[PDB]
């Protein structure tokens, strides 16, 4: 009609997406064409797979639930669209979207069906390890908070309980040199008072590492693998808000010793960190570098442009439970400040020419 | 090769895909062959669009990524798949996946295209609504965890304050009748002591509240919408390690007064939850259903065929920091409980009948 048969067959041979052709013979859905495209995706040659229905691809993986929805539309006529686990020839597994249009033949008296094919290894195996990524986040941030907040509220209440020890030591003294007949009342309630101060020191302690429980090590990691791994989750919202984005990696600085789990936290918090405070900036602009820093050290940089520091706010930064934000913890730069510096490096953070933020830490 | 160039234009001209053939003209791609699917994709017709190149469908929206990609893929004669911003012919907007394969027809000399496209408005919908979720989850994730420890090392440091104000007040009631020299002293160091407990009851309360300033809101909220939500967190893995999800629900019993937030975490929770006990099943089932139920509410059950519970284990359970596991906090269970009760309804757990566990919330 539009165009001639063959020309729009010779598109179909050469295009870059698998295409098949399928006859239906009974509960059998035999191939009766595939293009060059599906012998590359699955690895096998037309001549061998003709005929036959492409559930061979499944081979033994038969507990997937795209497979009965297939079945349904294929018996109801209705066009489907399902990822499947396939196999190659090699036996190499891939995702496989099935693209299936019913179609029938009058001529034929006899229904056929057209599939399109794509490989979805890719985009499965990047979205997985993102969930991954996502679980490995939010499971080391509710840890990382807490522990931040025990220890905080430890600190703050070391001075109050032990106060309150030294004026008992300070009345068992004085009550001493007492004859009066219910002395002895009042220092066995005052040991009952030091116990209890005692043993709220025990509490805190208790609580503070029911928390801290399950600590790590390090390890080799790359610089470029986890910046990317952390924008993969940090630096998400760039493209809607127009953020303008720079890596500038060294590759001679590119490997580091450092627990990728801890490192990517604090590059996620620098980065939201970095997104808010452009939001309502005109020149929006984060970049981030690595250099080699100390005496054999290496640093890597993350600036902005966003909306900077007052005079007071600098050195109020990287202390627990300082925030701008209405709704601000202060424990993200709190927690990233003693990250680094265990990991052998400085953090710290100072204005930049535009009037932004810029953070600094080194990593060996 | 296989069948008839009829029979294969039968298929592409059904097939539930749009698929364009397109015809090189200098810097054109002018369409030469458009299926019914891309006419009710695009909503234009085929004599209307036919013989001049598709870029009309980006109307004036060219700050697109994907136009220079297909450009440089088209001059290059490599294939390209990219998404792209497209507007129908009433100018609605839908994301449009273009697959296209550049082909060189000898008989011509000349270089035609085929492109396979889709519409995936409604994936990259959910995609940036699940990038929402994820930054959703992690905020409420952190301060809800240092939410329930605010209340959690107060309620424990609770009993031994108050002993060490309640055993100052007693002293000082046993040296009111005294004439001890050293009295006054005693009496105004245990002032101090009983000042500093006091002290330490502010700061507590003070820390809490300080993680406790975003917390109460509520909302009408849809049990539908929000279980999709957080399926889509929790349960992102249950296709691929072959979890059987089951969602019976009753339209008539789907719209609750609920705090859109503090739900949706309870799900998650609840949902990850399940996907671990059933880790190691053989059988694995996970069941979501909502019923009417009580004088006044409506009934949410999620059942699982997990390793359910020892003997021991339930009576722990909905209470705070009570875990199974390595790296549990065990307050998801006692911030799921207090928030449903906050909600108007209960929770409570049981065993199932296949060895597994199943939790029950109401709401309004
Ligand atoms: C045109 C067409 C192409 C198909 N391609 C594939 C494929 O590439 N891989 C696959 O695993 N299943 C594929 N299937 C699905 C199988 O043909 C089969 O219908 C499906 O596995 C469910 O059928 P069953 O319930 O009889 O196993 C395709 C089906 C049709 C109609
Ligand atoms: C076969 C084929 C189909 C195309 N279909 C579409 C389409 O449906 N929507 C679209 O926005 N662009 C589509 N394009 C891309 C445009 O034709 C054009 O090449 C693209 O906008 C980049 O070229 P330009 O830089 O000259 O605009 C298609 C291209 C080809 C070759
Ligand atoms: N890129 C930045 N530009 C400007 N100010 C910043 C930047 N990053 C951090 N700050 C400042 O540092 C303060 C503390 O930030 P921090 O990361 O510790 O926590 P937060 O963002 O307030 O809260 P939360 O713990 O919920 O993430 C912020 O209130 C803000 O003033
Ligand atoms: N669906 C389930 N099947 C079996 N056991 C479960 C299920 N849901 C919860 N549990 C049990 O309940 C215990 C407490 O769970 P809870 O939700 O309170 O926290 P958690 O998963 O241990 O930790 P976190 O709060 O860090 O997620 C778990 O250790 C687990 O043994």
């Given at each position: ?5 063959k ?5 179909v ?13 009974g509960?059998?859905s035999?191939l ?28 033994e ?7 009965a929805?297939?079945?349904?539309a ?6 489907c ?10 036996g190499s597994?891939?995702?496989n ?14 229904t056929?069906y057209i599939?399109?094919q ?9 979205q997985?390890?993102?969930?991954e ?7 080391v ?6 522990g931040?907040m ?9 001075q109050?309980?032990?106060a ?5 030591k300070?009345?068992?003294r ?5 004859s ?10 005052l ?11 025990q ?8 928390v801290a ?7 080799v ?15 998400a ?6 953020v ?7 590759p ?20 939201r ?18 250099t080699?820093?100390?005496?054999d ?14 005079d ?25 400040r003693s990250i680094?510096e265990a ?18 830490f080194?990593?060996?």
């Amino acid at each position: 009609h539009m165009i001639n048969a063959k020309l729009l067959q010779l598109m179909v041979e050469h295009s870059n997406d698998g295409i098949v052709v399928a006859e239906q013979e009974g509960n059998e859905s035999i191939l009766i064409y595939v293009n060059p495209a599906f012998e590359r995706l699955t690895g096998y040659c037309a001549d061998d797979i003709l005929y036959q229905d492409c559930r061979f691809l499944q081979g033994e993986d038969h507990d997937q639930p795209g497979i009965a929805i297939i079945r349904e539309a294929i018996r109801e006529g209705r066009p489907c669209c399902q990822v499947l686990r396939n196999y190659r020839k090699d036996g190499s597994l891939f995702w496989n979207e099935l693209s299936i249009t019913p179609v029938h033949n009058e001529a034929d008296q006899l229904t056929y069906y057209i599939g399109i094919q794509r490989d979805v290894t890719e985009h499965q195996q990047t979205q997985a390890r993102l969930q991954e990524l996502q679980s490995e986040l939010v499971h080391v941030s509710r840890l990382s908070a807490m522990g931040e907040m025990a220890s905080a509220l430890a600190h703050e209440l070391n001075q109050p309980l032990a106060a309150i020890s030294n004026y008992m030591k300070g009345s068992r003294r004085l009550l001493a040199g007492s004859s009066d007949p219910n002395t002895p009342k009042v220092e066995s309630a005052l040991d009952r008072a030091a116990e209890q101060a005692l043993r709220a020191g025990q509490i805190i302690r208790r609580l503070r590492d029911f928390v801290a429980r399950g600590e790590s090590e390090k390890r080799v990691e790359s610089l470029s693998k986890l910046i990317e791994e952390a924008g993969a989750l940090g630096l998400a919202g760039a493209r809607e808000q127009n953020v303008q984005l720079r890596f500038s990696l060294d590759p001679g600085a590119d490997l580091v010793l450092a627990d990728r789990v801890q490192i990517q936290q604090v590059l996620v918090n620098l980065f939201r960190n970095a997104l808010e405070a452009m939001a309502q900036s005109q020149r929006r602009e984060l970049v981030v570098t690595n250099t080699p820093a100390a005496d054999d050290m290496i640093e890597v940089e993350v600036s902005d442009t966003g909306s900077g520091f007052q005079d007071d706010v600098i050195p109020n930064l990287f202390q627990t439970f300082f925030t701008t934000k209405d709704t601000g913890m202060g424990v993200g730069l709190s927690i990233s400040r003693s990250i680094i510096e265990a990991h052998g490096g400085r953090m710290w953070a100072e204005s930049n020419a535009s009037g932004g933020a810029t953070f600094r830490f080194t990593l060996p």
